[PDB]
């Protein structure tokens, strides 16, 4: 077993993930295992998102996944923001996408 | 203008996700990022909120779904409600799986 | 057990009112999940709006298939603060129904 | 051009055109009917409608009747019925004020 | 005299607009035609204004010379006002006849 | 915002497009205040250069350039003659206005 | 979202919810049935009380002549249990605490042994 | 003799279940293998509960084998939360054996 609240065990395997994912590029009890995971896929996703913010900004291509998604939502911004006109916040985007296209925008 | 495009396109992309129930085959590059990301948004948020519904009705867990993962993230706030704890905000869950951890454990 | 479906069902719908705007497209699902889904769907939309309403009212606004009490609540609290601006106390009128007479009574009281 | 000027207080210009959207209502089934007096006369007539179709999709529900599918009518029956149901299944009745106006009341008072 | 002739070939347009609602068809001097056809479209215009202030005053929906959807949306912002309790200002910007209907809609 | 305030920032913005585009294209009463400051901006001005083409000798035309270039035609020639000016309000506005000031 | 609580001692919730789970036993024979606590209390005086049941059923089982069976209920273990205890009283032996047994086998093979 | 045989069977059960951790093919006469398999699962749950005993004074929180690992753990959890609240234990014999005797060895210090 383990001598751990389910708080704990959360916060400790969370870390893991975390980790797990910083060491390796993937994300290869069941309260463990489901902290490990979602912690590991979120740190990859923040990371693969920023870099195709800065894509965008950079003016790469976004592609045709969190990178293309945060390139493309970026680029939304971007062009907004090239216009001439302000951005408005538009929730049906979506998270990160409404976020990534405002911040871009301004 | 570009802000109404986007609404416009945005509207197409939801019923496109109400209608099929994916985004794979829909149809500026303006428009076409709206549609998609509004579709995606759209069964993203259904299925979250069908996964929450999911945990709190005792079902086990187990693409764009979000139902494992709001089914499972609910389910770490209901167990450490279920114990008498107080729950702490971790942002490292991610989006949404903070939130509705939060929002299971806090009722 | 009913209640416990009518709460967890009523936090799916607040959760759909948050998600999107609103609830005429609210997504094997029973009588009493569906009611409490789209009740308390409406009920967070309608208190938001409502109370959104006041805040431009209170601020100057003039108003004047949906749920939104954006302009009712405006036109209500409207009421109140044009009767508390002729420096007069208001009266309780039910008949202005919920939220008007609450809404108009709160505006005119401060 | 020489107009007629009417000097009524505010609060007594919302009760006369209060009372004059119920009695539109009443008279008439619709509230098709200065900002102030128009306001009230549509609240009350909407409110007067609005309690009226409540308390008849409240009675639907007792009686059996079906409240729609996928308004004041509907809503109430489907409220009343959230109140029947746990009733039938021998429970008690629990406040729910997430529910809303009217729903929380009607779901409790038919419960109860 | 030049000022007959105006007012002679201004009574013609303005019978013309009374007679045929339009002003592109002319029934000699530039003086006349000039005053013909201008006398026509003021007629033309300040009847589909007043028309148009007409019916925003009766709750019609507002929308060539026809002022009468101008006219119509002037004198609704007028109303719009006065509804609120509101006086109204004088707004220059909005053009002649705009400003002049929506006062007019405004005081009573 | 009150509608009071609406109306004059709609307005502005509807006379800041006319300037920066040369055309009125673009709540109701915002899109209406907006639009009529658009127009009038832009009637103002084309009945202006139809004043001052009259004015130069240059042709009106075989539109307010061509109305406001006729009316003020109609004071010059009036001058021309050695006439005195009257006013004469069935010309409308802005034509009486301006056959009066190019007959003064 | 408004919720209802409730501020209950723990002792109190245990008491509760242990008469629940009991009630429920002898209403219906299973213990399948919001916090730990009571949810624990619940399952806990639920099972024991159809323990006990089978239990004494199990030795009955025993002192009849019954089949304890092969290879919840505790029918099985305390018919076998109690065999023990008779099959050492019918050699003309006295009983011995065997607390390797555990519980209840132990006491069951006393019970029948001296009983 | 029947008790020599019982304590001789019972034996053995036990270093079955101390060789390996479980009591469900323990390898005759009846009495033998009654003995030898109660022995064999007294000594897996008395170990277990015991274990699950110190796991919850430790901090976790618990909440078709003979495990009591969860059962104790959780019983233990009890009593641990009732004298956290400053309040004294109370026998419940309803929790049955060994939860109210283990409830009760945790709520008391």
Same mark, same amino acid.
């Given at each position: ?7 704990? *065990?959360? /916060?400790?395997? !969370?870390? +893991? #993930?975390?980790?797990? %994912?910083?060491?390796?590029?993937? =994300? ?15 740190? *990859?996703? /923040?990371?693969? !998102?920023? +870099? #195709?913010?800065?894509? %965008?900004?950079?003016?790469?291509? =976004? ?33 990160? =996408? ?9």
């Amino acid at each position: 077993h383990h001598h751990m609240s389910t708080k704990d *065990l959360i /916060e400790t395997c !969370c870390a +893991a #993930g975390q980790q797990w %994912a910083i060491d390796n590029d993937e =994300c290869q009890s069941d309260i463990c295992r489901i902290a490990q995971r979602q912690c590991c896929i979120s740190y *990859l996703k /923040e990371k693969s !998102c920023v +870099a #195709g913010v800065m894509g %965008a900004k950079e003016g790469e291509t =976004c592609g045709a996944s969190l990178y293309k998604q945060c390139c493309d939502c970026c680029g939304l911004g971007l062009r907004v923001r090239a216009e001439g006109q302000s951005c408005e916040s538009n929730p049906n985007l979506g998270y990160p =996408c409404n976020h990534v296209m405002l911040s871009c925008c301004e």
